[PDB]
Design an enzyme around this catalytic site. Structure first.
Site, PDB file in Angstrom:
ATOM      1  CD  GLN A   1      -3.053  -3.744  16.519  1.00  0.00           C
ATOM      2  OE1 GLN A   1      -2.108  -4.403  16.060  1.00  0.00           O
ATOM      3  NE2 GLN A   1      -3.863  -3.058  15.745  1.00  0.00           N
TER       4      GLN A   1
ATOM      5  CB  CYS B   1      -0.846  -3.263  13.030  1.00  0.00           C
ATOM      6  SG  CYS B   1      -1.408  -2.670  11.432  1.00  0.00           S
TER       7      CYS B   1
ATOM      8  CG  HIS C   1      -1.604  -7.130  10.819  1.00  0.00           C
ATOM      9  ND1 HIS C   1      -2.022  -6.165  11.675  1.00  0.00           N
ATOM     10  CD2 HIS C   1      -1.084  -8.153  11.614  1.00  0.00           C
ATOM     11  CE1 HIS C   1      -1.750  -6.553  12.940  1.00  0.00           C
ATOM     12  NE2 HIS C   1      -1.175  -7.762  12.899  1.00  0.00           N
TER      13      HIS C   1
ATOM     14  CG  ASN D   1       0.011 -10.053  15.525  1.00  0.00           C
ATOM     15  OD1 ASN D   1       0.003  -8.891  15.127  1.00  0.00           O
ATOM     16  ND2 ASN D   1      -1.015 -10.884  15.307  1.00  0.00           N
TER      17      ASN D   1
HETATM   18  C1  424 Z   1      -3.121  -2.328  11.658  1.00  0.00           C
HETATM   19  N1  424 Z   1      -3.647  -2.348  12.848  1.00  0.00           N
HETATM   20  C2  424 Z   1      -3.882  -1.983  10.438  1.00  0.00           C
HETATM   21  N2  424 Z   1      -3.122  -2.174   9.215  1.00  0.00           N
HETATM   22  C3  424 Z   1      -2.381  -1.201   8.653  1.00  0.00           C
HETATM   23  O1  424 Z   1      -2.305  -0.059   9.132  1.00  0.00           O
HETATM   24  C4  424 Z   1      -1.594  -1.649   7.457  1.00  0.00           C
HETATM   25  C5  424 Z   1      -0.102  -1.511   7.821  1.00  0.00           C
HETATM   26  C6  424 Z   1       0.549  -1.219   6.446  1.00  0.00           C
HETATM   27  S1  424 Z   1       0.895  -2.819   5.677  1.00  0.00           S
HETATM   28  O2  424 Z   1       1.944  -3.421   6.449  1.00  0.00           O
HETATM   29  O3  424 Z   1      -0.338  -3.497   5.415  1.00  0.00           O
HETATM   30  C7  424 Z   1       1.500  -2.428   4.051  1.00  0.00           C
HETATM   31  C8  424 Z   1       0.678  -2.688   2.984  1.00  0.00           C
HETATM   32  C9  424 Z   1       1.097  -2.403   1.700  1.00  0.00           C
HETATM   33  C10 424 Z   1       2.328  -1.837   1.446  1.00  0.00           C
HETATM   34  C11 424 Z   1       3.156  -1.570   2.517  1.00  0.00           C
HETATM   35  C12 424 Z   1       2.721  -1.851   3.805  1.00  0.00           C
HETATM   36 CL1  424 Z   1       3.793  -1.496   5.075  1.00  0.00          CL
HETATM   37  C13 424 Z   1      -0.509  -0.355   5.710  1.00  0.00           C
HETATM   38  N3  424 Z   1      -1.787  -0.825   6.277  1.00  0.00           N
HETATM   39  C14 424 Z   1      -3.002  -0.629   5.761  1.00  0.00           C
HETATM   40  O4  424 Z   1      -3.972  -1.102   6.319  1.00  0.00           O
HETATM   41  C15 424 Z   1      -3.150   0.217   4.539  1.00  0.00           C
HETATM   42  C16 424 Z   1      -2.779   1.655   4.767  1.00  0.00           C
HETATM   43  C17 424 Z   1      -1.692   2.215   4.112  1.00  0.00           C
HETATM   44  C18 424 Z   1      -1.360   3.538   4.356  1.00  0.00           C
HETATM   45  C19 424 Z   1      -2.091   4.267   5.288  1.00  0.00           C
HETATM   46 CL2  424 Z   1      -1.697   5.919   5.646  1.00  0.00          CL
HETATM   47  C20 424 Z   1      -3.180   3.703   5.938  1.00  0.00           C
HETATM   48  C21 424 Z   1      -3.517   2.397   5.677  1.00  0.00           C
HETATM   49  C22 424 Z   1      -4.283  -0.139   3.585  1.00  0.00           C
HETATM   50  C23 424 Z   1      -2.828  -0.431   3.192  1.00  0.00           C
HETATM   51  C24 424 Z   1      -4.935  -0.879  10.484  1.00  0.00           C
HETATM   52  C25 424 Z   1      -5.370  -2.351  10.363  1.00  0.00           C
END
Ligand code: 424
Length: 219
Positions: free
Chosen positions: A19, A25, A163, A186
Site C-alpha cells: 500500500q 489498508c 489496521h 498484510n
Molecule cells: C490502514 N492503512 C489504516 N487503517 C484503517 O484504515 C483502519 C481499517 C479499519 S479497521 O480494520 O481498523 C476497523 C476498526 C474498527 C472497526 C472495524 C474495522 Cl474494519 C478502520 N481503520 C481505521 O483506521 C479507523 C477508520 C474507520 C473508518 C474510517 Cl472512514 C476511517 C478510519 C479509525 C478506525 C489507515 C491506517
C-alpha cells in the site's frame, strides 16, 4: 472445522501487495476478500483495483488515503455494480479522481456478512468461506518490526483496531505450549514479516482484536 486451513494452497490468494504511504489498508483487505470469493465463484483469480476503491468509495464513507472500512468498500462495489481490475486501474498510492470504467469490471458483490465476534466463529467462517477481512490492533512497534514465528504482543487491544488485513487460514506449529495461529496477509510488501504474512496468535483471548470486526462479501 479442520485443524489447519490455508487458502493460498487452493488458489484463492493473490501475491502480497504494498500500500505504500497511503492509508489504504482497508482497500487491500477488501480486495483480498473479494478476490477469494470471486475465485470460488468463477475459478479465476484476478487481482482487483485498490485504487478504484480509494478514489471512488467516498459516498459509502471511506476516506481514501486517510482510512476506511472493508464493509464500506463492499457496499461500494454493490452500489457501483462492479470493480475494476488492477491491470485496468493500477495502484498509485495517492487519492485521485474516480476513474471507474465499467468496461473493465471483473468483480461484483451482493452485500457482505459480519461474522460473530468470537474466534470460534471466525474459524468456522475461514474454514467454510475463504479468506476473511479482519481488523487488528497493529499499533505496536512489535508489529512494525515482526519477522517470523507466532506474533504475540501482551499489550495488544481486543477492542481498539487500526489496521485492516486478510485471514487466509489458520493452523498450529509443531514445536511449544502456545502453538496455534491465524495466517494473515498484510499489505506492507513481501519484505515485512514472513514474505508479507504474519502468523498471528490464535485462541489466546482474541489477541489484537482479530475476531472483533471480521467480514466478507457475498457474490
Ligand atoms: C490502514 N492503512 C489504516 N487503517 C484503517 O484504515 C483502519 C481499517 C479499519 S479497521 O480494520 O481498523 C476497523 C476498526 C474498527 C472497526 C472495524 C474495522 Cl474494519 C478502520 N481503520 C481505521 O483506521 C479507523 C477508520 C474507520 C473508518 C474510517 Cl472512514 C476511517 C478510519 C479509525 C478506525 C489507515 C491506517
Amino acid at each position: 472445522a479442520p485443524r489447519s486451513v490455508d487458502w493460498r494452497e487452493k488458489g484463492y490468494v493473490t501475491p502480497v501487495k504494498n500500500q505504500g504511504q497511503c492509508g489504504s489498508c482497508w482497500a487491500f483487505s477488501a480486495t483480498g476478500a473479494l478476490e477469494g470469493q470471486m475465485f470460488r465463484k468463477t475459478g479465476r483469480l484476478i487481482s482487483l483495483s485498490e485504487q478504484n476503491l480509494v478514489d471512488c468509495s467516498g459516498p459509502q464513507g471511506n476516506e481514501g488515503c486517510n482510512g476506511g472500512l472493508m464493509d464500506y468498500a463492499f457496499q461500494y462495489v454493490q452500489d457501483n455494480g462492479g470493480l475494476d481490475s488492477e491491470e485496468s486501474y493500477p495502484y498509485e498510492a495517492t487519492e485521485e479522481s474516480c476513474k471507474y470504467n465499467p468496461k473493465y469490471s471483473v468483480a461484483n458483490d451482493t452485500g457482505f456478512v459480519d461474522i460473530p465476534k468470537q474466534e470460534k466463529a471466525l474459524m468456522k467462517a475461514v474454514a467454510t468461506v475463504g479468506p476473511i477481512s479482519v481488523a487488528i490492533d497493529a499499533g505496536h512497534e512489535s508489529f512494525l518490526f515482526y519477522k517470523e514465528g507466532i506474533y504475540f504482543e501482551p499489550d495488544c487491544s481486543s477492542e481498539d483496531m487500526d489496521h485492516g488485513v486478510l485471514v487466509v487460514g489458520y493452523g498450529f506449529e509443531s514445536t511449544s505450549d502456545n502453538n496455534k495461529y491465524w495466517l494473515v496477509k498484510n499489505s506492507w510488501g513481501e519484505e515485512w514479516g514472513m514474505g508479507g504474512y504474519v502468523k498471528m496468535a490464535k485462541d489466546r483471548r482474541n489477541h489484537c482484536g482479530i475476531a472483533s470486526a471480521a467480514s466478507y462479501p457475498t457474490v
